[PDB]
Amino acid sequence: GSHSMRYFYTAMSRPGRGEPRFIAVGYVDDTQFVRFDSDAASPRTEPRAPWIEQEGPEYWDGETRNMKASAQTYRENLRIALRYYNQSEAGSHIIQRMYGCDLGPDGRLLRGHDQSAYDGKDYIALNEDLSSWTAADTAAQITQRKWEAARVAEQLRAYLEGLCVEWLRRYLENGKETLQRADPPKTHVTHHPVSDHEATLRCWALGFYPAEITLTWQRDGEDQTQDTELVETRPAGDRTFQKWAAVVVPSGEEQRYTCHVQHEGLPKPLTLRWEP
């Protein structure tokens, strides 16, 4: 299958309570593998997956230096953003960034990403061409001009096409046993009367990896999206994920309902029904 690497930075100001907290985490697909937290007793890039542990002292020292450098940069960026939005120094604000690379099933660079937000709203994004920018507002346009002048897009492109891909491939190899293993969902349908004339059918998917899945109910072969309650896919804590989809049906019509499950670990999509 296809794979991706992503880093997520969050920088949060907290006037009156010290310098902004900076936290960085790195993922391959849905597996976290590093963390850095400037609020740790001894801030260091640390392993969060077993296959990353074999990397040597130069790796960890390098990543730690890079992360502290980033922490400082993002403290600066929070001050700057205050100026860009005419905001006081009394409020707490958040900058976020997510970036990384996507590989196709052949191991080739599918596309790269580098996007940032301010207070939970789009701020600026590297376009798919890895050479131009999309600014969300006039403040981000200032940043865009600075980055065009410094040819930031060029350096980002060299990273995303080069180191990002090479190291993702390296991780994929080292974590072959888990990163390259899809676990199909374990699925079942439950039935609970709501009243004398209605019942809830709940279609469950458990123990699957990666998180991407599709659960839909059909009635007489027709999609019931509008009448389906879908919970957000949620992590189990053992790397796997869980999800359910529920529909309320007339008593005696249960057999007209079928749950359909699509997932990367399944050779073909599954159809299931309630089994009385």
Binding site: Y59, N66, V152, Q155
Partner: peptide, 9 residues
């Protein structure tokens, strides 16, 4: 491996 590129706003 993270990117070393500085992004000053």
């Amino acid at each position: 491996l993270t990117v070393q590129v500085a992004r000053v706003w």
